[PDB]
A = this chain, B = another copy of it.
């Protein structure tokens, strides 16, 4: 944790987001990907999970738009149909390799969650399995109900995120901290805005109390919207205004980038919100980019459907959707390249 060591972390964080690039999140656990597969009639075999990731990672030209990919631990042990380790597909493309390091969530208080896995995190970061990884991801999730998120749950999750971040950095990995505001709930956009300001300001408190190197941390955040069960409407401009206000109010100049999660919003909406936030005026130092799983890969799944004959078209949709995300990351989606 010397000066050159700290500069390498900042260089990695910037490389992931250079030139309007963003992150393809491919880190779904077998259970989470399985559910997605089963809706579309695809069998949850290890082989189909391996093939799905091969389809994503082998897409030609994807590195123009994708600066990093977040892998699931299992995918590090996997090869392509042709024999090449899946990580080698990304390395050869110059794409940064990430590892999701949380062990999921457990119950906290009444109706809330904390994320787990810190006890062996340092040991796991040193696994030879992840030797090629240069960044990591850890997700917490904030449920919304009456009087919730509670302050205890904000503090505990921010504490856990910050502890994970410092361990990552000590092992030479850039941490993505993901304080996700869960979309499935009944809350107004005002309430999301206000609580996002609490969560993000508290996260910055704990990162600072843990003396995390702030230029080597990426924040993966939810857009500010009302909850899916609210009857409240919003437009991309309003999402952009509220989200950017919350970020300008909470995120220090030293943070290199914010990457938005799609969170259950549509692919089109998530990309449209990104474009709108990048068209907003308001001085800032950090990039506003993407870390999408669903918004980038739902179309791939829906086109592929487990049939090899559909793969070329599935890869085409990945590339085209990645292009749009990247254009959104620079506020240029309305403009012809």
Residue pair A208, B214 in contact (C-beta under 8 Å): no
A201 is contacted by which of B197, B204, B286 (Cβ under 8 Å)?
B204
Q: Output the nearest chain B residue to A205 by Cβ-Cβ distance.
A: B201
Q: Could you give, for residues 169-209 of chain A, a 1 whenever the CB lies within 8 Å of some chain B CB and a 0 otherwise?
A: 00000000000000000000000001001101110110111
CA–CA, A137 and B249, complex, Å: 20
Segment 207-221 of A: residues with Cβ below 8 Å from B:
207-209, 211, 214-215
Find A204's partner among B194, B204, B214 (CB 8 Å cutoff): B204
A254 on the interface (CB 8 Å rule)? Answer: yes
A198 to chain B: which residues have CB within 8 Å? 205, 208-209
A1 sits at the interface (CB 8 A) = no
| Secondary structure type dominating chain A contacts | helix
Cβ distance A238 to chain B, nearest Cβ, rounded Å: 14
A148 interface residue per 8 A CB criterion: no
Which B residues touch A208, using CB under 8 A? Answer: 197-198, 200-201, 249-250
State whether A214 and B248 are in contact (beta carbons under 8 Å apart), knowing that A198-B209, A209-B201, A283-B285 are contacts in the complex.
Answer: yes
Q: Is the CB of B249 within 8 A of A250?
A: no
Of the candidates B194, B215, B248, which one forms a contact with A252 in the assembled complex, judged by CB atoms under 8 Å apart?
A: B248
A209 / chain B contacts, CB cutoff of 8 Å: 197-198, 201
Instruction: Collect the chain B residues with CB atoms within 8 Å of residue A285's CB.
Output: 253, 283-285
Are A251's CB and B249's CB within 8 A? Answer: no
Q: Which residues of B contact A283 (CB under 8 A)?
A: 253, 285
A: residues with CB less than 8 A from B are 194, 197-198, 200-202, 204-205, 207-209, 211, 214-215, 247-254, 282-286
* 19 additional A-B residue pairs with CB within 8 Å, beyond A200-B208, A247-B253: A197-B211, A198-B209, A201-B204, A201-B207, A201-B209, A204-B205, A208-B249, A208-B250, A214-B248, A215-B248, A248-B252, A249-B254, A250-B252, A251-B253, A252-B252, A252-B253, A253-B253, A253-B284, A254-B282
A-B pairs with the 5 shortest C-beta distances? A248-B254, A201-B208, A253-B284, A214-B249, A201-B205
